Design a binder for this molecule. Structure first.
Ligand SMILES: OC[C@H]1O[C@H](OC[C@H]2O[C@H](O[C@@H]3[C@@H](O)[C@@H](OC[C@H]4O[C@H](O[C@@H]5[C@@H](O)[C@@H](OC[C@H]6O[C@H](O)[C@H](O)[C@@H](O)[C@@H]6O)O[C@H](CO)[C@H]5O)[C@H](O)[C@@H](O)[C@@H]4O)O[C@H](CO)[C@H]3O)[C@H](O)[C@@H](O)[C@@H]2O)[C@H](O)[C@@H](O)[C@@H]1O
Ligand SMILES: OC[C@H]1O[C@H](O[C@@H]2[C@@H](O)[C@@H](OC[C@H]3O[C@H](O)[C@H](O)[C@@H](O)[C@@H]3O)O[C@H](CO)[C@H]2O)[C@H](O)[C@@H](O)[C@@H]1O
Lengths: 1266, 147
């Protein structure tokens, strides 16, 4: 609290705090009056403690104590032998006695200067002694620097002496040379028999190629010394590898028998069958089919990998421990590989096992960048945040034909982009979300999704011959991440089977909702005839801004009205604005009399996936239970975190760190709004963790009352107003929102009676008053009014719910509540101070007062008419007549509004401790309870068997390890028993438990909603080889990635023996016979109808768009660098292997001939049309003819390269010895300078910066303007 | 231990001799390391949702301000944007940022105390001026106006 400009702290006790206090982990102080101290020193006990100027938090400073400076730490101890920075960012060093050092000093091996007051000189020169020394900006350490004396640059070394006949730096990082006279040199200079190039400024240029002595000259990256680049830098001549061991280690066979493989290809951890085995390191013996050995014992992709293998295996006791490099001779490495092979066979005999080796190879393989995620470009922006990035599979019939999709895989066909017309913009859908993304643009897959849909809508019929245990409707998960055809497919299915387009009674018997977050989805859904209900994020959003989020600065309640709906916000005139910038809330409620058609919708305050998952994890992070949001956690870890979350939720202080504010007030509005189907979140009713329905939340009573009141009173028209005109509040204004419903046939304030002369209205209707300001106090004059309407003149009303300083009181019946009577015009008038009387006769006192406690931060009052019958029902039944010929399914009206959906699960529930406490068992016993709260549809969690802790590569997701059912391997397994007969429940119970749960809900007149999850599937056990490109969520290639059309081992193939195999495609034939039009109707995104001619009993890559990155590497599938062809052994007519393995002679190295230089890879093949790196790290390009590209005298060294590997296409600068220039400037034959990047490519049309803070500009044609 | 290489770049090697990567706390200091294990110094960095500035020589996490669109914004040491509060920049200037995140200017009364911010938005301390038409000295400690 703030009093007279000062912070005071008032305890949980209610006591004002003085003295030193650690409050919530921060050390602070308050003087005798209780005010807090900031930017000052205080003395407590033996400590001299400074407190910060912003926060008032204890930290280090320097005080002038008496006449002298003395340093202090956070705890208030005098510091000795240390450095302290003071309030103004100045630095002292205090010695062994606590006294600050002055003058020149050597501290921790560093030279530093201190002024006469003990302050450290930083970022300037300083005349200590005869010499002048520069001291660095942040360290303050002595360093070489240059300054301008007269008009000429001069150099100063670290000792403060001027530099003569030598090179010296400046702080920025530029090197200069200064001659005998001290003067900086320029241009081309030969000193100590070596030649350096200094630019016009005098900067020494390193890694710079230029024609300097009329003959090319490359200036060293190390020292800038000019070499002629005539000497070849490759150190490996052409050598033969074959020897006495070659025929023994060669493969027994060139096929799947002798080679571990995937779709014919080989992998880094492949093992093969050699012809013979050096058993025990003694005697070569023919191999038996079980004698498999690792390919890396005998072959390597390149010398670097070979050297790394030798060093790694050496470290494990297998030979002389070695430092080998790619520069080591090939002959040496091969000899060393054999002594390791010997040692290996000895440890195989000694251990009588090869498992130890499997683990050694696996370990070694993950060490190498090409075989781990370092070549996968892990990224976390956008949806990549979930799992680290995506790979899009490609159609490549030449290399990977099993994986070809038949020209499907249209990505990002979300509703707004169903036809691809926004593919080039951000309007393209984020097709990739999680795990293996199913290709819902493929007609065959579309048919399979319909089969699954049929299976769910007839679950009970099919699995228990129980026609009462069937789901009634669906929730469509992740609409914006799949092909929008699925909506039409689902819509048309329900039309065909249930005649949902015939009547509101048919439609409303199968309530179906969409998870459709895009702000333009509502209008799409409505153009397509509302086959499923859109969400209304606009109201959920406004709850966030005005009530639910944040302790203080909240949007005004005014924003709920959306007055812009009317021209000039003319609430007097009420002219609807026919043309607006596509904005505002979906349904206006200022004066909604049901006269204008509106888009039917569901709405909510929270969800299993909204305002839950993030807070619950932030809480775990905040208490050090995990480090990252993507971090894997155990259920025990979750339970501990949950305890902090609950503690925060129920905090009597009223402050909430992770949880949402004002949930009751939010539900009061959600549950009284016209033209919406409200949805209630299990986790606002019961605690989100632990056991299902284990313990109610503090909000439960209030929400329960609102729910029951909704059945009795909520009908008719609506109005909504605020004591507020905009962002800013005038003097009297409270910003208190007043929402009213009138009764069954009453549509307006001024309507006094129904047209049909029904009397139902008189005891119906409701009044809601809500505020978002806990510190709200009314002026004494101020009156606040609820216009209950002219159909309710002089009527007695009683409170349902009233907020106060300790909680919110809930009144169950007319007798126990305060009454108040409306006037002749039908208004309930409220003042700052009120005296209400019970109908009994008792008098009650009540202030219109903002309150702050666990249940509210603001005001909440709800009022209902007294005299309500016990069985009073204000709901409207849906009519069987064909009311509309518009073609649409759902219509927003009184009937639809009479529904309430309950989202009845939480992602963070604990696993059942016993079968009796399984969610679906509990639902069956408690069905009664939900009927009486007015739930007409029960949204059950997804019932599919969780993929669990299974993880074939890449990052696991919480859906999977929390077993919530959104992550599954088998789409048709909803809790079936193991094949041995044992029970095998999901998190929610067996399949019988589910059928019982569904039946129980029908016995209590409620529907059951199936969560339809078509976007992805997790943890498929079978491997295939795909052609993959690294992409972002929309399937766009990452800008700077080498990972393009590469072969990759993915987990895409289903077991083939699961419930997907049993029930896959089975119901389609029966359906085509009975409803032919479903199978003949064309879909929009494809132009085709769904295709039931092919059944999906087993998933595989051809039906997938892609996957999250699996951490295997860009080149885990083995390839020859020289030809760029991948090794394969599937068909004996098209085998490609390294020549060693076929007992042929593999020659490897560089060899010159009259025409030029050639290169042979470790596998014995000639490099053509490919880049090659030598053992010293230099790069070369070999042209289509097989010859190294090299610059000639008088010719342009810049060459344009078009390779088989497209990503490398570009302009390169090859020197006379063929070395590609990288990360440096290169001069062409005509004097123009270009720059070439990390990978050798020319850079165009941008500014480029230097480590020394030099800037250069490169024109569009590549040249450097600088 | 820390080691700086030939080019003046810095790594930290752990108990096994392997360099640390990503966000780390060392000697009680928060620091970031790129995918190659190199230490980020003198720049912003999007680690998680938050954006954090790391100091030029220490590389330690600190509050800083950057210009987003055409308006100065404030970033704290944890990488969260600053709203309704004072925040520094690396140079040493203090600013105040309102509920909307926007830096304030001129004479401002917040939490019943009065501060003077110049045209650039710098909080002025140890500054004497006739501000409310009556003399006012702005504190050397916190910049709060006394009479
Ligand atoms: O223009 C001067 C008037 O400004 C205020 O009036 C705002 C309007 O209020 C009523 O309609 C609103 C309707 O706009 C919408 O508001 C949602 C949301 O708005 C604010 O949050 C925004 C946030 O969405 C985001 O905006 C980004 C930009 O989006 C578009 O490009 C906009 O055109 C642009 O202006 C936005 O900047 O980020 C913004 C910055 O952080 C943020 O401002 C507001 O803070 C939230 O509380 C609010 O939920 O839906 C509301 C219902 O939910 C409607 O009530 C009026 O009908 C409309 O005419 C107004 O223009 C101000 O109050 C008026 O007094 C000014 O005259
Ligand atoms: O931090 C505890 C440690 O501090 C001293 O060690 C310093 C070390 O911190 C470093 O100083 C560089 C630089 O850092 C601060 O920002 C300071 O303001 C600035 O003046 C300082 O120059 O480098 C030196 C070199 O070894 C170290 O000595 C203490 O000496 C040590 O005993 C403390 O434990």
């Amino acid at each position: 609290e703030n009093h007279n400009g000062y912070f005071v702290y008032i305890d949980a006790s209610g006591k004002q705090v003085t003295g030193l206090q650690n409050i919530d982990g921060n050390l602070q102080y308050f003087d005798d009056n209780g005010y807090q101290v900031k930017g000052s020193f205080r003395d407590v006990n033996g400590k001299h403690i400074y407190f910060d100027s912003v926060t008032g938090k204890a930290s280090s400073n320097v005080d002038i104590v008496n006449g002298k400076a003395q340093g202090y730490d956070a705890q208030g101890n005098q510091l000795k032998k240390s450095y302290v920075a003071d309030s103004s960012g100045q630095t002292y060093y205090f010695d062994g006695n606590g006294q600050p050092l002055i003058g020149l000093q050597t501290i921790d091996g560093n030279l530093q200067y201190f002024n006469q007051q003990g302050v450290q000189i930083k970022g300037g020169f300083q005349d200590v002694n005869n010499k002048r020394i520069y001291f660095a900006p942040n360290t303050g350490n002595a360093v070489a620097n240059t300054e301008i004396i007269n008009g000429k640059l001069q150099g100063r070394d670290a000792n403060g002496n001027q530099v003569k006949n030598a090179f010296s730096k400046d702080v920025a990082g530029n090197t200069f040379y200064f001659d005998a006279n001290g003067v900086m040199l320029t241009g081309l200079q030969t000193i100590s028999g070596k030649t350096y190039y200094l630019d016009e400024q005098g900067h020494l240029r390193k890694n710079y190629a230029g024609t300097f002595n009329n003959q090319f000259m490359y200036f060293d990256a190390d020292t800038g010394a000019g070499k002629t680049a005539i000497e070849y830098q490759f150190d490996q001549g052409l050598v033969s590898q074959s020897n006495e061991n070659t025929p023994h280690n060669a493969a027994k066979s060139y096929d799947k028998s002798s080679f571990e493989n995937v779709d014919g290809y080989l992998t880094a951890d492949t093992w093969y069958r050699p012809t013979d085995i050096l058993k025990n390191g003694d005697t070569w013996t023919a191999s038996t089919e079980t004698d498999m050995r690792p390919l890396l014992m005998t072959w390597w992709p390149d010398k670097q990998t070979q050297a790394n293998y030798l060093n790694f295996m050496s470290s494990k006791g297998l030979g002389i421990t070695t430092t080998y490099t790619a520069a080591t001779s090939q002959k040496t490495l091969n000899d060393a590989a054999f002594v390791i092979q010997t040692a290996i066979e000895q440890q195989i005999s000694l251990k009588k096992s090869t498992e130890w080796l499997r683990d050694a190879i696996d370990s070694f393989v993950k060490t190498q960048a090409n075989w781990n995620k370092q070549t996968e470009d892990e990224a976390f922006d956008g949806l990549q945040w979930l799992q680290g990035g995506f790979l899009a599979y490609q159609d490549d019939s030449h290399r990977t034909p099993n994986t070809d999709s038949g020209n499907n895989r249209k990505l990002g066909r979300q509703p707004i982009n169903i036809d691809g017309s926004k593919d080039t913009t951000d309007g393209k859908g984020s097709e990739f979300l999680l795990a293996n993304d199913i290709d819902n643009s493929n007609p065959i897959v579309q048919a399979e999704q319909l089969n699954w849909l049929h299976y769910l809508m007839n679950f009970g019929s099919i699995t228990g011959n129980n026609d009462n245990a069937n789901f009634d409707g669906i929730r469509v998960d992740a609409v914006d991440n799949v092909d929008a055809d699925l909506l039409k497919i689902a819509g048309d299915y329900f039309k065909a089977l249930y005649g949902t387009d015939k009547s509101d009674a048919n439609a409303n018997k199968h309530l179906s909702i969409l998870e459709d977050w895009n702000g333009k989805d509502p209008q799409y859904v409505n153009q397509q005839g509302n086959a499923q209900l859109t969400m209304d994020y606009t109201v959920t959003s406004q709850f966030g801004n005005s009530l639910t989020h944040g302790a203080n600065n909240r949007s005004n309640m005014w924003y709920f009205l959306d007055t812009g709906y009317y021209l000039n916000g003319d609430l007097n005139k009420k002219i609807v604005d026919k043309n607006r910038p596509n904005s505002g809330t979906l349904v206006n409620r200022i004066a909604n009399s049901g006269d204008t058609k509106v888009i039917p919708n569901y709405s909510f305050v929270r969800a299993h996936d909204y305002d839950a998952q993030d807070p619950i994890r932030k809480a775990m992070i905040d208490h050090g239970i995990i480090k990252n949001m993507q971090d894997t956690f155990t259920f025990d870890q979750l339970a501990q975190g949950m305890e902090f979350y609950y503690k925060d939720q129920e905090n009597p202080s009223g402050f909430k760190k992770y949880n949402d504010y004002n949930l009751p007030s939010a539900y009061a509005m959600l549950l009284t709004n016209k033209d919406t189907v409200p949805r209630v979140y299990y986790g606002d009713m019961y605690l989100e963790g632990g056991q299902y329905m284990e313990k109610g939340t503090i909000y439960n009573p209030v929400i329960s009352a609102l729910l029951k009141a909704r059945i009795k009173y909520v009908s008719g028209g609506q109005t909504m107003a605020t004591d507020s005109s905009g962002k800013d509040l005038k003097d009297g204004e409270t910003d208190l929102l007043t929402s009213v419903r009138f009764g069954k046939g009453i549509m307006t304030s001024d309507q006094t009676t129904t047209q049909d002369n029904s009397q139902d209205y008189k005891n119906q209707g409701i009044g809601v008053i809500v505020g978002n300001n806990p510190d709200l106090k009314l002026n004494n004059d101020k009156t606040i009014t609820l216009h209950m309407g002219k159909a309710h003149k002089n009527q007695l009303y009683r409170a349902l719910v009233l907020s106060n300083d300790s909680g919110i009181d809930v009144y169950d019946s007319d007798d126990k509540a305060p009454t108040l009577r409306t006037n002749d015009n039908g208004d309930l008038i409220f003042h700052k101070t009120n005296t209400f009387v019970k109908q009994d006769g008792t008098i009650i006192n009540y202030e219109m007062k903002g309150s702050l406690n666990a249940l509210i931060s603001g005001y909440l009052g709800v009022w209902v008419p007294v005299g309500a019958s016990d069985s009073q029902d204000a709901r409207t039944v849906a009519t069987e007549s064909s009311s509309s010929n518009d073609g649409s399914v759902f219509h927003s009206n009184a009937a639809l509004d009479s529904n309430v959906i309950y989202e009845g699960f939480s992602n963070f529930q604990a696993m059942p401790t016993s079968p009796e406490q399984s969610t679906n068992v509990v639902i069956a016993t408690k069905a009664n309870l939900f009927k009486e709260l007015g739930i007409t549809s029960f949204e059950l969690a997804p019932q599919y068997r969780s993929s669990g802790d299974t993880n074939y590569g890449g990052m696991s997701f919480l859906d999977s390890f929390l077993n919530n059912g959104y992550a599954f391997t088998d789409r048709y397994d909803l809790g079936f028993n193991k094949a041995d007969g044992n029970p095998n429940p999901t998190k929610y119970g067996t399949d019988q438990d589910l059928r019982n749960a569904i039946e129980a809900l029908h016995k209590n007149g409620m529907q059951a909603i199936a969560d339809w999850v078509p976007d992805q599937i997790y943890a498929l056990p079978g491997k295939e080889v795909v052609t993959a490109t690294r992409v972002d969520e929309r399937g766009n290639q990452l800008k700077d990635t080498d990972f393009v059309n590469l072969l990759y081992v993915a987990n895409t193939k289903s077991s083939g023996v699961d419930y997907q195999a049993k029930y896959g495609g089975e119901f389609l034939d029966k359906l085509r016979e009975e409803y032919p039009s479903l199978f003949k109707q064309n879909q929009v995104s494809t132009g085709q109808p769904i295709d039931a001619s092919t059944k999906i009993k087993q998933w595989s890559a051809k039906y997938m768009n892609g996957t999250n990155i699996l951490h295997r590497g860009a080149y885990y599938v083995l390839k020859d660098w020289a030809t760029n062809q991948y090794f394969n052994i599937a068909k004996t007519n098209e085998v490609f292997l390294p020549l060693q393995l076929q007992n042929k002679d593999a020659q490897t190295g560089f060899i010159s001939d009259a025409s030029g230089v050639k290169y042979y890879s470790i596998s014995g093949y000639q490099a053509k049309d490919t880049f090659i790196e030598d053992g010293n790290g230099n790069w070369y390009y070999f042209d289509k003819d097989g010859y190294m590209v090299r610059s000639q005298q008088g010719e342009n060294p810049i060459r344009t390269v078009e390779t088989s590997v497209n990503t490398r296409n570009g302009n390169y600068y090859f020197m006379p010895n063929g070395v590609e220039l990288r990360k440096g400037f290169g001069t062409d034959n005509s004097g123009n300078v270009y720059y070439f990047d990390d990978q050798g490519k020319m850079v165009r049309d941008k500014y480029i910066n230097d480590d020394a803070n030099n800037f250069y500009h490169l024109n569009v044609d590549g040249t450097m303007s600088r």
